[PDB]
Amino acid sequence: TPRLKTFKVYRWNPDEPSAKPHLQSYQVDLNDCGPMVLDALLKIKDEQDSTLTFRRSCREGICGSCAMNIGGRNTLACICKIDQNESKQLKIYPLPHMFIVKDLVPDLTNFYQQYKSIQPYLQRSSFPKDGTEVLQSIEDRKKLDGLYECILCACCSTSCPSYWWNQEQYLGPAVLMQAYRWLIDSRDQATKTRKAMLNNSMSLYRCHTIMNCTRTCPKGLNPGLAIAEIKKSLA
Amino acid sequence: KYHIIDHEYDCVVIGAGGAGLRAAFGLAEAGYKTACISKLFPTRSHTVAAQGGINAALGNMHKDNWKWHMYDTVKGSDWLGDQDSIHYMTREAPKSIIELEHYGVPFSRTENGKIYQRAFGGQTKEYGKGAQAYRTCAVADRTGHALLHTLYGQALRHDTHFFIEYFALDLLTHNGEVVGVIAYNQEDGTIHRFRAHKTIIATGGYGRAYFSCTSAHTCTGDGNAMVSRAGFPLQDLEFVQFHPSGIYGSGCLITEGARGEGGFLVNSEGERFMERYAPTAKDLACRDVVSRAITMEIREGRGVGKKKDHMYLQLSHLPPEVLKERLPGISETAAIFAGVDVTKEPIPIIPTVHYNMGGIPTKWNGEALTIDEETGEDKVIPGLMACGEAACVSVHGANRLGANSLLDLVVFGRAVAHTVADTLQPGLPHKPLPSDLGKESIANLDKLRNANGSRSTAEIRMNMKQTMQKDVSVFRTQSSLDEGVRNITAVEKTFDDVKTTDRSMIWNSDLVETLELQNLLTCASQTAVSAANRKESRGAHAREDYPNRDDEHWMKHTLSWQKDVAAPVTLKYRRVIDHTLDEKECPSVPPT
Amino acid sequence: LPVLPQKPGGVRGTPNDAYVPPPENKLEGSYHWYMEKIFALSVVPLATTAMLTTGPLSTAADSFFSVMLLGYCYMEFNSCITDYISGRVYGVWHKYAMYMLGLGSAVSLFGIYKLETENDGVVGLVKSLWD
Amino acid sequence: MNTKAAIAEEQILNKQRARRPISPHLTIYQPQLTWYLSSFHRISLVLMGLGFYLFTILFGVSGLLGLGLTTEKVSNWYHQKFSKITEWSIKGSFAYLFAIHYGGAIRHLIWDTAKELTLKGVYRTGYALIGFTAVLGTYLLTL
Ligand SMILES: *Cc1cc2c(cc1C)nc1c(=O)[nH]c(=O)nc-1n2C[C@H](O)[C@H](O)[C@H](O)COP(=O)(O)OP(=O)(O)OC[C@H]1O[C@@H](n2cnc3c(N)ncnc32)[C@H](O)[C@@H]1O
Ligand SMILES: CCCCCCCC/C=C\CCCCCCCC(=O)O[C@H](COC(=O)CCCCCCC/C=C/CCCCCCCC)COP(=O)(O)OCCN
Ligand SMILES: C=C(CN(C(=O)c1c(C(F)F)nn(C)c1F)C1CC1)c1ccc(Cl)cc1Cl
Ligand code: SF4
Ligand code: F3S
Ligand code: FES
């Protein structure tokens, strides 16, 4: 005897541009389905209405392609687990305050132009003479833990109310953590010019320490403490 | 109805993995105009999932030698690899890990200030007789993740025009040589014609033609089907590798570093697979004998299971301090899909499809090959190159040694950019072709969009997956391989009645999945015919009716041709190269 | 308020373009961070010695509380102009909202003076208003 | 080419960019303690800073265009102006807006020295803010 849970998915069609967006309701049998949310989105597309478009690739949670807003919070659809209670429903949305392309596909073009501008590469000027690698201690390598392993899903940037309104000029908490990964690197001897891109009105100084950035990160990193140390280093 | 946009470049690279990114800025640091066409964002490729290391004979924990590394790659392939590409890869391997550190890869350090390197299986020192060596050069559990994010940030230092989210359809070809590609913009809905002098294919492997695999959702064979549709062959498609460890039910993977420092596969009786049934005296061996250890253990009854197809891997022996410093990415990926911790109870394991040791036949410098129809020698295809997993240099041969596929991307992505500069001069006029160059690839995009049949594209995809798992699998014979050829031929004649219910051209994802089904049906039909024609057993292809390895008659490769879906497949063979690049630097390794 | 014409769709160009960051203007950057932490570090101890006082404060201790309350209140009204009335979308009216935070806070400092010299303090006004 | 092929592709993409909607941001998001206890720190000072300005621009307007205002002269007009049932709806809502801003400004003087910024420390300095407000705000009524 089947157990039918009701999903409510956002819909928009760019070939009828005057139609308003709306939520559409599907019912999935939870007995023959996977335990994650992406396993129930891929059954609506195969055995039901096949015009539902979204992004996916690894189903593990390491690339960051299926970022959406599931049930009120920003998470990845292949980690979020279906609450096994068919008396309740679920509301799925795109990422908030983003210009949508088709259905759950946001336009992350501005997000990639702001990441190119922080110059994410090593900027030394000299290398050893025998052809061996440049040295680094164990206590200086430990400074990089918890920073280099961001997967760039933008689930922290599209939860920050300063990034909802001011996002054509404010860099957001996901780019400002990768700017700190290159500032405390002990092999990168270009530090004075990486603190002159951030010493203006609104590139760094729109953070008001609300902290929805550290609360909603699916990988468990802390992008709200990394902005508190850039402000303490520019003083 | 359609409108086409024309670009004009020097070199075009198709793919943004670890091989298509290393070759992209290697050509743009030399003065060339390069364009990189990618379907995903470049830091979402499948090489972000790698968790091992990169083998290199640096020698900063003990003494080492690059001639010891070469002997292990040659022996571990059952002597089907090309011995002039083993001599090139294992010599240029220390020079390419020190160069990779100057980009900013956060390698794990040692208490002298040097790179830290661990032990995988296969590498023993002093010419195959000695203790286990230590060369893997790992970042903790994110060696594949920290190698994309560094190679992508270095491609922004130079100029490389990334064309993100484009789906390449076919190669343009005029009179036996290729002159560019043709793509399809997903966000906008346009057709683009690119023209170049050398086009480089670095798409990747096909793994989604099987039911259970460790690959991504976008790992379809897209470069192998563009090449096979133009009249060029594919090589050694019968050697598929089945990983020993992998999650029961979904296909997710735990790394082989869990057995590098402490690891026991404990069955229902409670023994270690070290001898007495299906074992070599040493564990940590190559990936197919251990895969032929587990599959022979489950059928005779010596295996715990809920339906008796299941195994275990103990991790309770390890101290808790080493589980947070060496393997931190393993303790979180098992407590989600399997739901148990790594410190108290063991984890379920099944063998699934991992790697493909076959693809485009290539020389060791990057140029793609064919064969002559008069004498049977080799022949260079003008304008085409290949690198990565989609290429088959025969460095891996018949069996892949672990952590040699990340060294494969860096060494043979650096050698592609070095031999273009020695042939092609920058700035050259293009030839004027007809105005409908590539009109048979838009006539196929129109037919698959206004499609009307009885079978949907997700129903024919399931008859292909359940056929390849039933017949072309770990244990093969010539009574279940002939049933695989007659079944995969009947599936291909139902693609004529496919059904598609989305006629938009902006992010038409119902069209992209039925374009990737046309690519997987070409790659899967040539695997069932190639594997049913080789009557011997070597490497990762084990025939039960011919259990001995034959050397005097079957030491050759296989080349296969198929133009379209539902078309006959033919076979021809070419000899394997058994001499080094220099006879005085490293002598050849004889068979044993 | 009249709204300037915006970029179509929020973005303009290809992902292989780049954001061009503004020049260094640290009188609006790092030095503005210093002023917002001096007014806050001297209105928290001074208000604590106003709940422990018997009556009103002295005119040496009440003028220093009132001038440090006007700058603390100016720096937050300054930070609500630059979040909601921005020069990107309104243009001229980002500066006209910052000049009416001029003589609406220069008359306020004249109002501190005509409370302190004839009457007693600002705290002597709110303690007699009640709360 | 490649500049004629960039103008032609940006003409039909700047046309499709103008008809895309914005996805909803408020009214769908989950109520949490991180952005509910932070909107009470901007509301409480705007409602208090307006009263501080209006009572000092009144004494500084009546200095120039001289009317002669005094503290005991405006205190009768405010006391005698409102009934008893609205005298305590105004002062009953300024006592709790003063305790949530006095105790929330010490929470921000800790967060500029980069301390107490883990998720375990954002929540345990926010449970003191709801205890400090309910005790200091009720003691201020008895004065
Ligand atoms: C799957 C896997 C592999 C793996 C591993 C673990 C897993 C789960 N662990 C490894 C390890 O520990 N050590 C090791 O040495 N190797 C390990 N591997 C194998 C390794 O990951 C692969 O060999 C390697 O990732 C292959 O890299 P390559 O560059 O060849 O391939 P890719 O990264 O998958 O490339 C994907 C790109 O191709 C573009 N693409 C594909 N099709 C198209 C079309 N039609 N049009 C345009 N672009 C296309 C994609 O955009 C993507 O960028
Ligand atoms: C750190 C926050 C900064 C606030 C910025 C806002 C500007 C104005 C705010 C406050 C003005 C001065 C505060 C006075 C300090 C409280 C005094 C007190 O607690 O004493 C009470 C008086 O009761 C109160 O006043 C309660 C404090 C709440 C005051 C109003 C809250 C917000 C005020 C906004 C100002 C709006 C207009 C008011 C007058 C205009 C001039 C400021 C009773 O007197 P005693 O018996 O002598 O106390 C000794 C006990 N042993
Ligand atoms: C409901 C909100 C949204 N919101 C903010 O806008 C915000 C911001 C950010 F917009 F810059 N920084 N700080 C400190 C805030 F309170 C809070 C939730 C985060 C709100 C709260 C008060 C006011 Cl007067 C206006 C608004 Cl609309
Ligand atoms: S910090 Fe966390 S939430 Fe933000 S982009 Fe990185 S992984 Fe995503
Ligand atoms: S949520 Fe936003 S306001 Fe700052 S502390 Fe995080 S970037
Ligand atoms: S699919 Fe890659 S993270 Fe969800």
From TrEMBL, chain D:
Q: Which GO terms describe its biological process?
A: mitochondrial electron transport, succinate to ubiquinone; tricarboxylic acid cycle
Q: Which UniProt keywords apply?
A: Heme, Iron, Membrane, Metal-binding, Mitochondrion, Mitochondrion inner membrane, Quinone, Transit peptide, Transmembrane, Transmembrane helix
* Full protein stretch here: 56 to 198 of 198
Principal localization reads mitochondrion
Q: What is this protein called?
A: Sdh3p
Q: Does the keyword Amino-acid biosynthesis apply?
A: no
Query: So what family is this one in?
Result: Belongs to the cytochrome b560 family.
What are the leading ranks of the lineage?
Eukaryota, Fungi, Dikarya, Ascomycota, Saccharomycotina
Specify the protein's topology with respect to the membrane.
Answer: Multi-pass membrane protein
Q: Name one GO molecular function term.
A: quinone binding
Organism for this UniProt entry: Saccharomyces cerevisiae (strain JAY291)
Q: Which residues cross the membrane?
A: 43-67, 88-110, 122-141
